[PDB]
């Protein structure tokens, strides 16, 4: 019996997701537990039919819904889906930003191993990426400049979401001609945000419009995963759902100033008995934790499930 | 706004009302021996690479313009119809650089280019060492559409956007009209394969 | 005359699907038939996915359409196909002999 699935199953039972208005016109996709193949081409017409499916049919380790609207969402033939517009998306990754500590070890012996398998025990090696709150602070600067560009240069009304793991998401819900932009008409918007073709305006005022005033305020380009903006058919992670590599809520950020990276992002309460793999002095969810290999520790469920999904150990019991 | 310089102001079925009524363009071309020669004079000057003369040099500038579009719709050469739209719109670029700001907007409205005036935005540049002034605004969605087949200089990055509107100056407003004239001429020839012209008039332009 | 080019686009190919688009198909739809620059993007993409054993991206297709529009290139003749790429001639004739 998988203990993590029960935590996820218990959440989606009572949790209310942030689903769009045109719910019946979007393709749903998820990643089940214990597998890597994606189950897509799903169509749901209400939040009660989706709640029925996640709890009783296929529990999602990751849960997405398509950014594009389709008149026939559950069709495999591409042109049979009848594409009728898609939202504008922006993803800010921490890959380029902070570059974090990362160890690779064997879950049995505990020694640091670079190869795919440990030569002693013949097991798959695991990797742990230390997500620090300082990285979230750096990434939070980019979403502030990105929202500034989308509001002062395009007149758009974007929403900010926490990605559930490493970065943030910026989504602009559009229904008119903004949703019919081509893949190349979205790349001119992406490279405008990144400051690719933007020339250096070396002697402009700080009150100048566009990039002239922004280049002189000390702000350069915005670091985004430009592949998300180019794609006209993307899978948006459903807000208020759970991430598969942390177990945190995809929470909408109404104000970027009072966003804290702590245990409040995880909905799980109670305590768990956590059996670590490695002795490490790492920062987890805003605080430093010292784990000892093979010595069980009683920590909160919010911090226990987080370490389990980052391959740092195992959750053995719930108390 | 001179009609002798810009023949696309008067429609084809509007210039013909001078001749009473019912006299279509096919009636004049069958009787006129020189209207077809003035059209072939422009077609054979695009193939060689030379310029195209201004429409102020003809006696019937509106008729010469439409008989040239009709003669290209009979030749059916797509590589030639395309080559004409560049040399034709290039001929208007020189006539546009000597036009006041009021007549430039009067043409962009007839081309359905959503471009209006606004409060002038002034800013300084180091590379140009001048004082740049933008006084024409276009929505960025329409801007990405107009600059669909243009160079890299028209990219959204090298522009000044504010609240979703790209700010243009005088030489950029002319740059979008020249691209629009090239586009309309391509559109204005596709549905010209309809009217079955008398087969003798087809052999005259061939 | 360019009657055989529409026949191959209506059926499909197998081996040389990219070489038929670069030197023949894309030049005919843009510089002979005169369809929209984006209309030819769907006409060429539906041609590549007939045997479906392969994937073409919209990046390489737009690069060929915008390339022949500037260079003004015209599609190759069947006699020129026999001179250059003889493997593509047999691939086309097998489709032509199917009617
Ligand atoms: Zn080991």
* Morphology of chain B: elongated
Distance between the termini of chain B: 35 Å
Give the CATH level 1 class of chain A: Alpha Beta
Q: What is the third-level CATH name, the topology of chain A?
A: DNA primase, PRIM domain
Assign the CATH architecture of chain A.
Alpha-Beta Complex
Strand order in the sheet with the most strands of chain B: 1-2-4-3
Computed CA radius of gyration of chain B, to the nearest angstrom: 20 Å
Given the structure, what is the number of helices of chain A? 7
Main sheet of chain A, how many strands, which sense, barrel?
Answer: 5 strands, antiparallel
Largest sheet of chain B: 4 strands, antiparallel
The sequence of SSEs of chain B as H and E is: HHHHHHEEHEEHH
- Structure classification of chain A: alpha+beta
Ligand catalogue: zinc ion
**CATH superfamily grouping of chain A:** DNA primase, PRIM domain
> What overall geometry of chain A do the principal axes of the alpha carbons give?
globular
* Percent of residues in beta strands of chain B: 5-15%
Most extensive interface, chain pair and sizes: A-B, 28 and 22 residues
Number of domains of chain A: 1
> Helical percent range of chain A?
10-25%
Measured by DSSP, the beta-strand proportion of chain A falls in 15-25%
GO biological process, one term (chain B): DNA replication, synthesis of primer
Keywords (chain B): 4Fe-4S, DNA replication, Iron, Iron-sulfur, Metal-binding, Primosome
Organism (chain B): Saccharolobus solfataricus (strain ATCC 35092 / DSM 1617 / JCM 11322 / P2)
Protein name (chain B): DNA primase large subunit PriL
């Amino acid at each position: 019996t998988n203990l993590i699935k029960s935590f996820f199953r218990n959440y989606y039972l009572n949790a209310e997701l942030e689903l769009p208005k045109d719910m019946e016109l979007r393709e749903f996709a998820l990643q089940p537990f214990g597998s890597d193949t994606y189950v897509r081409h799903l169509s749901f017409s209400s939040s009660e039919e989706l709640r029925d499916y996640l709890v009783n049919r296929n529990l999602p380790l990751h849960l997405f819904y398509s950014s594009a609207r389709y008149q026939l969402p559950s069709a495999r033939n591409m042109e049979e889906k009848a594409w009728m517009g898609s939202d504008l998306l922006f993803d800010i990754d921490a890959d380029h930003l902070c570059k974090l500590r990362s160890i690779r070890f064997c879950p049995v012996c505990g020694n640091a191993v670079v190869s795919e398998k440990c030569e002693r025990d013949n097991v798959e090696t695991l990797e742990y990426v230390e997500m620090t709150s300082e990285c979230i602070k750096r990434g939070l600067e980019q979403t502030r400049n990105l929202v500034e560009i989308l509001e002062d240069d395009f007149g758009l009304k974007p929403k900010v979401y926490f990605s559930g793991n490493r970065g943030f998401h910026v989504q602009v819900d559009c229904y008119g001609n903004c949703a019919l932009l081509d893949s190349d008409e979205r790349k001119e918007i992406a490279e405008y945000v990144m400051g690719i073709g933007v020339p250096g305006y070396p002697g402009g005022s700080e009150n100048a419009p566009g990039w002239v005033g922004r280049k002189n305020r000390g702000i350069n380009g915005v670091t985004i995963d430009e592949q998300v903006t180019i794609d006209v058919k993307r899978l948006i992670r459903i807000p208020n759902s759970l991430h598969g590599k942390s177990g945190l809520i995809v929470k909408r950020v109404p104000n970027l100033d009072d966003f804290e990276f702590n245990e409040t992002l995880s909905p799980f309460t109670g305590y768990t008995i956590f059996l670590p793999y490695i002795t490490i002095e790492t920062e987890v969810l805003g605080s430093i934790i010292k784990l000892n290999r093979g010595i069980p520790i009683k920590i909160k469920s919010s911090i226990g499930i987080y370490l389990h999904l980052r391959n740092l150990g195992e959750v053995k019991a719930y108390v | 706004l001179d009609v002798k310089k810009y023949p696309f102001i008067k429609s084809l079925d509007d210039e013909l009302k001078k001749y009473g009524g019912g006299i279509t363009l096919t009636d004049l071309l069958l009787n006129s021996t020189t209207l077809i020669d003035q059209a072939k004079d422009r077609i054979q000057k695009t193939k060689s690479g030379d310029e195209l003369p201004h429409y102020v040099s003809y006696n019937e500038p509106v008729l010469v313009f439409y008989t040239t579009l009709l003669s290209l719709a009979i030749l059916n050469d797509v590589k030639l119809i395309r080559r004409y739209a560049y040399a034709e719109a290039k001929q208007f670029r020189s006539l546009l650089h000597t036009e006041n700001e009021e007549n430039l907007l009067e043409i962009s409205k007839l081309l359905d280019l959503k471009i209006n005036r606004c409060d002038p935005i002034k800013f300084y540049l180091e590379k140009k060492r001048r004082i740049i002034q933008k006084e024409f605004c276009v929505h960025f969605i329409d801007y990405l559409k107009y600059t669909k087949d243009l160079k890299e200089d028209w990219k959204l990055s090298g522009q000044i956007l504010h609240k979703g509107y790209v700010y243009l100056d005088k030489n950029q407003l002319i740059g979008l009209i020249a691209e629009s004239i090239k586009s309309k001429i391509v559109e204005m020839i596709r549905p010209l394969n309809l009217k079955e012209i008398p087969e003798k008039l087809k052999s005259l332009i061939e």
